[PDB]
Homo-oligomer: 58 residues x 2
């Protein structure tokens, strides 16, 4: 049904650094995270999905 | 090895909001700020360092 991204350690680490630079999981936006990460192939849909999961995880 | 924890404008703004809720910079504790901010990797030492500077700051 849904295509999922391969969140490697390196990619997840880049994501967490982006989230933190934007003030944390509650303050960061998918678009802001996407803009900071500058990863070829990454999309809003996938960042949003991961950010929602990250918030769920804590 | 390890990233520096940089106090970006957005992370600083989150900090200031937490301090304000705790009654200002002298009344706030570092652990209280840390608990409010919920940022992965942020430690009591990062927040103490920043809060010590902010206590001496003239302006919000």
């Amino acid at each position: 049904g849904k295509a999922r991204m391969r969140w490697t350690p390196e990619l997840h680490e880049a994501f967490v650094e982006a989230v933190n630079s934007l003030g944390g999981s509650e303050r960061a936006t998918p678009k802001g995270v996407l803009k900071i990460m500058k990863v070829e192939g990454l999309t809003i849909y996938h960042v949003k999905s991961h950010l929602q999961k990250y918030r769920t995880a804590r």
